[PDB]
Amino acid sequence: AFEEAEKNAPAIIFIDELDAIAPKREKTHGEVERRIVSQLLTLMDGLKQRAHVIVMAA
Amino acid sequence: EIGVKPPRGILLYGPPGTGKTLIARAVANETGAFFFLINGPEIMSKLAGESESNLRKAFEEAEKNAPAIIFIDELDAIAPKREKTHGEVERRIVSQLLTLMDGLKQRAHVIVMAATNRPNSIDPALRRFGRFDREVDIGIPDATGRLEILQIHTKNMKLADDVDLEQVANET
Amino acid sequence: LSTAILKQKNRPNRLIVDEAINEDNSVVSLSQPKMDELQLFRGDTVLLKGKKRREAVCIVLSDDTCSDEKIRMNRVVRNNLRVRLGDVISIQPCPDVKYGKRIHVLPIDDTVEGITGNLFEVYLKPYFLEAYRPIRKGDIFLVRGGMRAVEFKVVETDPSPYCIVAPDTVIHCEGEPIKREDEEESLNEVGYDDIGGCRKQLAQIKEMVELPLRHPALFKEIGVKPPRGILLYGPPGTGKTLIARAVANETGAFFFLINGPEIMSKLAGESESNLRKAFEEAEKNAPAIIFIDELDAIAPKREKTHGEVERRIVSQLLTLMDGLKQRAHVIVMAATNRPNSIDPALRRFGRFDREVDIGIPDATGRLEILQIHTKNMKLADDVDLEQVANETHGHVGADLAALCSEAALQAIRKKMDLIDLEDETIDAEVMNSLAVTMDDFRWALSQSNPSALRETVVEVPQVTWEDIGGLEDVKRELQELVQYPVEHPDKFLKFGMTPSKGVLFYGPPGCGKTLLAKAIANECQANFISIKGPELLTMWFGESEANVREIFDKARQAAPCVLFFDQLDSIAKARGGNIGDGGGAADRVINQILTEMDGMSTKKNVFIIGATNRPDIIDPAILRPGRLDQLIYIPLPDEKSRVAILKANLRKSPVAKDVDLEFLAKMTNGFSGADLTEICQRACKLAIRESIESEIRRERERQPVPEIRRDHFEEAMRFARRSVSDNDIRKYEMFAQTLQQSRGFGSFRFPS
Amino acid sequence: AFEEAEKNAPAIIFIDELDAIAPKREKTHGEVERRIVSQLLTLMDGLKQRAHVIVMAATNRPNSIDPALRRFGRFDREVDIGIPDATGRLEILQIHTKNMKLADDVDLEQVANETHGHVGADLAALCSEAALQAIRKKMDLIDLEDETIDAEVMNSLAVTMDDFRWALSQSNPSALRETVVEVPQVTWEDIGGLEDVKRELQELVQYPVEHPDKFLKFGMTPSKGVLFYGPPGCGKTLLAKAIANECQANFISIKGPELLTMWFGESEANVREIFDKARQAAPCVLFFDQLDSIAKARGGNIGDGGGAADRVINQILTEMDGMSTKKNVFIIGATNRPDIIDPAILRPGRLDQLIYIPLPDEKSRVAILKANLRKSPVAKDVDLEFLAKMTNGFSGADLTEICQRACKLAIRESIESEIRRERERQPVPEIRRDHFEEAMRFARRSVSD
Ligand SMILES: Nc1ncnc2c1ncn2[C@@H]1O[C@H](COP(=O)(O)OP(=O)(O)OP(=O)(O)O)[C@@H](O)[C@H]1O
Ligand SMILES: Nc1ncnc2c1ncn2[C@@H]1O[C@H](COP(=O)(O)OP(=O)(O)OP(=O)(O)O)[C@@H](O)[C@H]1O
Ligand SMILES: Nc1ncnc2c1ncn2[C@@H]1O[C@H](COP(=O)(O)OP(=O)(O)OP(=O)(O)O)[C@@H](O)[C@H]1O
Ligand SMILES: Nc1ncnc2c1ncn2[C@@H]1O[C@H](COP(=O)(O)OP(=O)(O)OP(=O)(O)O)[C@@H](O)[C@H]1O
Ligand SMILES: [Mg+2]
Ligand SMILES: [Mg+2]
Ligand SMILES: [Mg+2]
């Protein structure tokens, strides 16, 4: 999703229900959710890249 | 001359924002060695054998371009304790890391670096000597260190004369 | 008997390596009576065995200066044989040695640099002119001459592998120069000598992977087939992979290395195909050894495994290891930190019949490991490796390598002033001044801490026995508790009684229990694990007891280890008194603690100390001797102890001489240690307040308090309160009197 | 495979590790595995059309096999290759020792009687280890680095009964490789007093295994369950250690909460596995130290928690009921809190015999003091009878603590004497009466009235 949005560099990403996808890595027993939180952190770190892509989460 | 091998494993740990990834980027830019960067979740795959193969490919690429520095960001996501992990894939990934860093074949010139917010969630076999030799705590800076951070982050901006960065360092 | 396979027994061939006065690369010298014993004449070609499957050939010459029990050889022959001074090698006559038709030699890359002249013409042709020197494949020989002497690798011999370099033999230096790094990696190759400790384990391994190959006639005559499956298990860093490398380097059998995760493949049946290919490769190559590192990666229990691929891989390994088509003389070795995670069907005699515990070494074992790891290091004369071996209580061998590396790194740090990071190269004077002293090893010891305890590391506030005032008897008991079983086990064996290893501090708040724990953590010569009571408890079912089991296992591995519980009554409370507490989670934690502390397992030097602020609620089985043997009562300090506490608090504090601590201790009746510390802190705060007001006054005039004074202490005292009320002392004295009256005899005297 | 079997008929198709390719299709998450199970079903159904092909399969997880494969017309016959008895173990030993060079003193009958839980691979391991010990005894005469061996060394080489006894000392069933624990060498003479308990335990262990015919003749089934209850430190775990070291029965010792697992269904599976591997090693003793953790009163904590402990205790009750008398699996439970043991556990047929390990009396205290000081150098004037008299309410642990405190006082005296001698340059042959006198004032009674 991040790659596709960055392709269309004037892009806005909207992550609806961010609470479900991104819980606390330590608090949640599920390893899938801690991994997805870490991947989202990595994507946000490189998100800017001096690109028009912006991300809004609800 | 001194007859030892210099330590080959660095584990940076600390709360978020201390600059572990920043230090990794600084090392990547300012060292004269091949740099390979690994993100924890990006290794994960559904198919059995893909993730261990990705780790093997990264370590082989580092070995070919030796001396090299491998940085594994978000080590906690990729390497949980095998006793407390149910999934076979994660346990096999941790075993592949253990073998790659310290196995019957040892890495000659590759430096393996990692960063994690929670070092105690790492499998204790990784925190052994031969694999992650030293653990470096990137902690909360003091007043002078955070004044240095403010100076670093304010160097590009144009600042008025009234700006007093030592006061801001004291207050934060 | 178990280690009987390790002795050399001093056969006539056995000889001690010694330095060579004038012996060239291709000759060695012995004592004349030694030749007469071996029936060797001067000039006879001889064959010398070495370590890690190496052989060399030399010309034996008579040297009167050579010792009777020693053989003189230069550095070249030593490096060819991978031996050092003092090593024992066997010399035997070599029959049917003939002049070599042709030899191909490959020079080392670093030596040939800076030599414009032809390598053959400048060095090989005069060196091998009428040389009559015996050589073998794989040897390094150095030839002097030119600007830099040149090392040649004899890669090809005709006839192989032994040949005499006659003048008619053609010598050619063409070819890719040999890398210095490759020969260096060949030199620093791991053999059975690089494993320290694990003497019985190494004996068993050599019995199983070396003896059947070296002397198969024994097993053929005695009519049995030797064991063919070895599972090396142990905590991380104990040397399982090291033993695997040693076996790989020091066996003539073909060696196949399997790493667990490498087997896996995404395709259907491709992992089973990889396993079959590995076993077919081993079978094709006659005697072969298969080593599977990280066995738990690809051999989980089939009953506990959900994926079908993993179960099929376990079944494939089961069939390959012991199936209808039997193994054709193949030794299978495996290493794992989790032997109980392996499939139970793999652990039987047919497949993995011998399980070898590479455990935590003792003092002598870790001394041996330190000697092995420092054999290459440059050491000063001041270094005492026995002291370092005694200091490192819970180290496994990887921790000792870490300690040696830290010492070397500190030694390099001490030279960072003379050394420049930026400059191209380091001065030779600095390199000659570089050495590892005992101070570097002391620093490494200070930083050293067993890796298994890395998770259970807490920053302790550096308390000394002097920081505690009073409690002299308690200090002596604690020091003796931690020191006697560790430093004098022979005394306990002589008196035939195991030591007591349990102490419970009970008393009013603020009287010095946690201070005693800090003093133990900083002063006692043992590992220390600090446990807050409820941190072990977990929401999940069976995980709180798992945490208890894990922490006790960590204390067992790092023995001698001190296991301190800051609030015991939280983790240790009487059973049956909780309506909720999960599904009896607290009671199950109590029972797990009871089993871990005194059960059917063998007892180790694990000193378990608990501090409780109210001991009447702790389970009575916890206080049973053999668990918390001594119940030490830490009461409110008396006047002497109050003087000691006040002096200890103000020892580092600049205090005016007018302050009479005896009068303070006399007045403060019923005060605890925290009360007196608060009095001193309040005096310090008042002094700081006065100094700040004085500084404000000087600042006002621009636009004092050198030490804490008597009036500061008086104003601090007017705020003082007695934290522990009389009823609290009544309760603690009630518990203490129950304990004392339990015995029933104030004075016990034997009848005369 | 099936077509090639038909081409060359009569044919036998052996499928080793049948559970590898034939799991239950409902539990399978792979399409290819389910298709393989269906193909096996189809081929075994069509086996009737095939003239003389016979399919024999081997598996050590028969319950994991797809149930449809065990129906009529396909794998309809099942052969249980069970654990051999004493005579069967003798036959296996005779088979494995036929090629070895046994000495005359060897007695395979004794070796057959000792190996209570061995299955045949264990007996082969035992023979291999005995021969390896025999080879070890010659490692003094032959060095490993030697190139060749004298023929006389081979001629002298032979396996003797001492080698087999060493092997038996090292030998253990392969099944009990995960439950094995290091147990201290506790002996019946290490325990002081408890003579009636010792005799009762020895009889309860030996009589059912040695003479079941008398119990069948009188029609009474031997008791297969014992609970130990008493004050802490009175000798329950010590008795368990003595049983493990002395009795010729396989011993499984498990900690209380060892079986519990957070994952749903795993604790019941752990109970099933422990009881099954107890049956496989019969005659076996299954000891439950701190039983009240494993078995607590149902409904007392039902509301608080998920209810997994109730499932665990129900599974335990099912396993206690499921055992036939023919399997000699003695179950011993130990607890110092019998009041919180589940009442169902003590019902007839499960943990029948309830034994009260009491606070020792004066004669038992003399026995305990002698047993503790048996290996210790104690002065003659030290009167143990008076120590037993004065320690009225003391338990065995209390007396052991008194002796340990006296030992530590003696060690302190010796250490200080050595320090003093080193100081003067730059003792304590045994424990004395003053040491015990000093140790007694620190002594306390651990168990209250
Ligand atoms: N010590 C520091 N000195 C200067 N700038 C810093 C420092 N720490 C953080 N920053 C600034 O804040 C940003 C965030 O830091 P960074 O992403 O490295 O944090 P982190 O918590 O170590 O990372 P991650 O959790 O992704 O490993 C940096 O890119 C930099 O701009
Ligand atoms: N007994 C020993 N003697 C000498 N060196 C040792 C010993 N044990 C470990 N080492 C050294 O310490 C390190 C331990 O690494 P090694 O791979 O041998 O450990 P391991 O027991 O296989 O660990 P893991 O369980 O994590 O695989 C190596 O550098 C090895 O040389
Ligand atoms: N004997 C002592 N000598 C010096 N300071 C003492 C002494 N006893 C207590 N203190 C002081 O008490 C404070 C800490 O007390 P500590 O943590 O040892 O108490 P505690 O007995 O463990 O209490 P609690 O029951 O509340 O956990 C420190 O300020 C320390 O200086
Ligand atoms: N009859 C006895 N003879 C010799 N020593 C004994 C005797 N009874 C107890 N002891 C010793 O006293 C201590 C009691 O420990 P033991 O394991 O026997 O206790 P337990 O009855 O299982 O109690 P707990 O309920 O506390 O687990 C041990 O050190 C043991 O050696
Ligand atoms: Mg390893
Ligand atoms: Mg405290
Ligand atoms: Mg007990």
Side-chain angles (χ1 to χ4, degrees), chain B residues 102 125 128-129 131, chain C residues 194-196 198 235-242 245 294 337 369 372-373 396-398 401:
Chain B
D102 208 323
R128 197 252 281 166
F129 161 70
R131 301 185 181 98
Chain C
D194 285 20
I195 297 90
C198 306
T238 58
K240 306 177 285 292
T241 310
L242 179 76
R245 310 189 203 107
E294 309 292 331
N337 314 138
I369 301 175
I372 283 158
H373 279 124
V396 298

Side-chain angles (χ1 to χ4, degrees), chain C residues 594-595 598-600 624 627, chain D residues 232-238 240-241 287 289-290 334-336:
Chain C
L594 289 175
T595 59
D598 205 347
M600 293 178 71
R624 191 261 290 168
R627 305 160 174 153
Chain D
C234 283
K236 309 182 282 300
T237 310
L238 202 75
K241 300 177 195 179
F287 180 63
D289 206 12
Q290 308 303 334
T335 185
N336 63 96

Side-chain angles (χ1 to χ4, degrees), chain C residues 441-475:
Chain C
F441 269 102
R442 279 297 178 92
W443 184 78
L445 283 163
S446 66
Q447 317 301 305
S448 191
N449 189 358
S451 175
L453 305 195
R454 274 196 193 190
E455 294 195 347
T456 54
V457 166
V458 183
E459 198 189 357
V460 177
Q462 199 71 44
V463 178
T464 302
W465 292 120
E466 275 68 56
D467 295 334
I468 320 177
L471 297 170
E472 307 295 327
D473 189 358
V474 183
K475 293 170 181 172

Side-chain angles (χ1 to χ4, degrees), chain D residues 305-353:
Chain D
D310 294 89
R311 301 191 279 270
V312 163
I313 184 58
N314 295 330
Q315 182 66 74
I316 295 167
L317 296 164
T318 306
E319 309 277 12
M320 305 198 81
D321 301 344
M323 292 180 183
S324 73
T325 303
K326 322 295 191 323
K327 290 167 301 188
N328 296 115
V329 186
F330 317 98
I331 292 181
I332 305 186
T335 185
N336 63 96
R337 283 295 282 278
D339 63 358
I340 70 178
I341 299 294
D342 197 290
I345 288 290
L346 315 181
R347 292 181 186 176
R350 66 179 65 88
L351 292 204
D352 291 331
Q353 295 298 109

